[PDB]
């Protein structure tokens, strides 16, 4: 029975490149002249945005999206926390979501079952392995998973037979 893995992963280097290019891009923008603002990648999972005002962080969000997309990253993996403002300025934590949690995995099994597909899905850590009797059932699952309404970017690899 052939199988593949449904994954939700972000390349750690390209994630670093996008943040570096976003900081470089701020240094060339005229409305951030001498303005204390920065992106900080934390543990390869959290991007901390900080600026004097709520609007300037909103601008940085547009920069961060464009940079991540420019390095091939589906920005739907971004989880934006609340914009926190104190006297020092505005700060916002953006979680770069990776891996398929048990919550989203069971959701992934349920629309597969809902789609009454000839596949058997099993959670294995933060990935979902899909097994079917033939390869075209797997693509039927892959084609369905692509055209779904999901809160996570999905990739597919580790095709075994």
Short mmCIF file of C-alpha atoms in Angstrom, two decimals:
data_model
loop_
_atom_site.label_atom_id
_atom_site.label_comp_id
_atom_site.label_asym_id
_atom_site.label_seq_id
_atom_site.Cartn_x
_atom_site.Cartn_y
_atom_site.Cartn_z
CA UNK A 1 0.00 0.00 0.00
CA UNK A 2 1.64 3.23 -1.18
CA UNK A 3 1.78 6.16 1.21
CA UNK A 4 2.89 9.77 1.56
CA UNK A 5 3.16 12.36 4.33
CA UNK A 6 1.07 15.50 4.70
CA UNK A 7 3.43 18.04 6.26
CA UNK A 8 3.37 21.72 7.19
CA UNK A 9 6.98 22.89 7.25
CA UNK A 10 8.94 26.07 6.59
CA UNK A 11 12.57 26.02 5.47
CA UNK A 12 14.61 27.35 8.39
CA UNK A 13 17.13 29.15 6.17
CA UNK A 14 14.58 30.86 3.92
CA UNK A 15 12.68 31.92 7.04
CA UNK A 16 15.93 33.49 8.26
CA UNK A 17 16.60 35.09 4.86
CA UNK A 18 13.12 36.64 4.74
CA UNK A 19 13.57 38.22 8.18
CA UNK A 20 17.03 39.51 7.23
CA UNK A 21 15.67 40.98 4.00
CA UNK A 22 12.78 42.56 5.92
CA UNK A 23 15.23 44.30 8.26
CA UNK A 24 17.31 45.38 5.26
CA UNK A 25 14.15 46.68 3.59
CA UNK A 26 13.27 48.83 6.62
CA UNK A 27 16.70 50.48 6.43
CA UNK A 28 15.88 51.72 2.91
CA UNK A 29 12.37 53.05 3.63
CA UNK A 30 12.09 56.80 4.11
CA UNK A 31 9.25 56.67 6.66
CA UNK A 32 11.48 54.59 8.98
CA UNK A 33 14.23 57.24 8.96
CA UNK A 34 16.11 56.89 12.25
CA UNK A 35 13.00 55.08 13.49
CA UNK A 36 13.64 52.31 16.02
CA UNK A 37 11.96 49.34 14.34
CA UNK A 38 13.08 45.77 13.77
CA UNK A 39 12.10 42.19 13.03
CA UNK A 40 13.57 39.55 15.35
CA UNK A 41 13.36 35.85 14.52
CA UNK A 42 13.11 33.92 17.79
CA UNK A 43 13.95 30.19 18.03
CA UNK A 44 13.11 29.86 14.33
CA UNK A 45 9.42 30.01 15.29
CA UNK A 46 8.47 33.52 16.47
CA UNK A 47 8.94 36.79 14.58
CA UNK A 48 8.79 39.77 16.94
CA UNK A 49 7.77 43.05 15.31
CA UNK A 50 8.43 46.31 17.16
CA UNK A 51 7.85 49.91 16.13
CA UNK A 52 6.90 53.23 17.76
CA UNK A 53 3.25 53.00 16.68
CA UNK A 54 0.54 50.48 15.84
CA UNK A 55 0.41 51.73 12.25
CA UNK A 56 4.15 51.25 11.71
CA UNK A 57 3.90 47.61 12.81
CA UNK A 58 1.01 47.22 10.35
CA UNK A 59 3.35 48.51 7.64
CA UNK A 60 6.01 46.03 8.76
CA UNK A 61 3.44 43.24 8.47
CA UNK A 62 3.07 44.07 4.77
CA UNK A 63 6.86 44.01 4.44
CA UNK A 64 7.13 40.73 6.35
CA UNK A 65 4.45 39.10 4.18
CA UNK A 66 6.14 40.20 0.95
CA UNK A 67 9.55 39.01 2.15
CA UNK A 68 8.25 35.59 3.25
CA UNK A 69 6.37 35.13 -0.02
CA UNK A 70 9.49 36.22 -1.93
CA UNK A 71 11.31 33.24 -0.38
CA UNK A 72 8.56 30.78 -1.32
CA UNK A 73 6.82 30.66 2.07
CA UNK A 74 3.02 30.47 2.22
CA UNK A 75 2.20 33.29 4.65
CA UNK A 76 -0.95 31.50 5.83
CA UNK A 77 1.41 29.80 8.30
CA UNK A 78 1.58 33.15 10.13
CA UNK A 79 -0.33 33.49 13.41
CA UNK A 80 -0.55 37.15 14.40
CA UNK A 81 -0.90 37.90 18.10
CA UNK A 82 -2.32 41.09 19.55
CA UNK A 83 -0.47 44.34 18.88
CA UNK A 84 0.74 45.36 22.34
CA UNK A 85 1.46 49.05 22.94
CA UNK A 86 3.19 50.58 25.95
CA UNK A 87 5.15 53.81 26.42
CA UNK A 88 8.18 52.35 24.61
CA UNK A 89 6.16 51.64 21.47
CA UNK A 90 4.19 48.88 19.77
CA UNK A 91 5.12 45.19 19.67
CA UNK A 92 3.53 42.16 18.05
CA UNK A 93 4.39 38.45 18.12
CA UNK A 94 3.96 36.52 14.87
CA UNK A 95 4.11 32.74 15.24
CA UNK A 96 5.41 30.91 12.17
CA UNK A 97 3.20 27.84 12.50
CA UNK A 98 4.87 24.55 11.55
CA UNK A 99 3.81 20.94 11.97
CA UNK A 100 0.28 19.52 12.06
CA UNK A 101 -1.06 19.43 15.62
CA UNK A 102 -3.51 16.76 16.74
CA UNK A 103 -6.32 19.33 16.44
CA UNK A 104 -5.67 20.08 12.76
CA UNK A 105 -4.73 16.45 12.03
CA UNK A 106 -8.11 15.07 13.12
CA UNK A 107 -9.65 17.83 11.02
CA UNK A 108 -7.51 16.56 8.16
CA UNK A 109 -8.83 13.02 8.66
CA UNK A 110 -12.44 14.21 8.88
CA UNK A 111 -12.75 15.94 5.50
CA UNK A 112 -10.90 12.98 3.99
CA UNK A 113 -13.62 10.75 5.45
CA UNK A 114 -16.16 13.42 4.47
CA UNK A 115 -14.89 13.22 0.97
CA UNK A 116 -15.42 9.49 1.26
CA UNK A 117 -12.02 8.79 -0.21
CA UNK A 118 -10.27 5.52 -0.62
CA UNK A 119 -7.50 6.46 1.80
CA UNK A 120 -6.55 5.66 5.38
CA UNK A 121 -4.99 8.50 7.37
CA UNK A 122 -2.82 8.10 10.46
CA UNK A 123 -1.17 10.75 12.60
CA UNK A 124 2.57 10.26 13.14
CA UNK A 125 3.97 13.01 15.32
CA UNK A 126 3.27 16.36 13.67
CA UNK A 127 2.69 14.76 10.25
CA UNK A 128 -0.22 12.89 8.67
CA UNK A 129 0.60 9.73 6.71
CA UNK A 130 -2.03 8.83 4.11
CA UNK A 131 -2.27 5.27 2.77
CA UNK A 132 -4.33 3.96 -0.13
CA UNK A 133 -4.52 0.85 -2.26
CA UNK A 134 -3.42 2.71 -5.42
CA UNK A 135 -1.47 5.85 -6.26
CA UNK A 136 -4.42 7.63 -7.91
CA UNK A 137 -6.30 7.50 -4.60
CA UNK A 138 -3.35 9.36 -3.08
CA UNK A 139 -3.48 12.13 -5.68
CA UNK A 140 -7.25 12.23 -5.17
CA UNK A 141 -6.41 12.90 -1.52
CA UNK A 142 -3.61 15.30 -2.48
CA UNK A 143 -5.79 17.17 -4.98
CA UNK A 144 -8.53 17.41 -2.35
CA UNK A 145 -6.16 18.56 0.39
CA UNK A 146 -4.75 21.27 -1.90
CA UNK A 147 -8.20 22.69 -2.75
CA UNK A 148 -9.35 22.72 0.89
CA UNK A 149 -10.21 25.50 3.36
CA UNK A 150 -7.43 24.93 5.88
CA UNK A 151 -5.66 27.21 8.37
CA UNK A 152 -2.28 25.71 7.40
CA UNK A 153 -0.10 25.45 4.30
CA UNK A 154 0.24 21.81 3.26
CA UNK A 155 3.12 20.10 1.48
CA UNK A 156 3.51 16.44 0.55
CA UNK A 157 6.63 14.27 0.55
CA UNK A 158 8.04 10.90 1.68
CA UNK A 159 6.19 8.95 -1.01
CA UNK A 160 6.77 5.28 -0.14
CA UNK A 161 5.55 2.05 -1.72
#
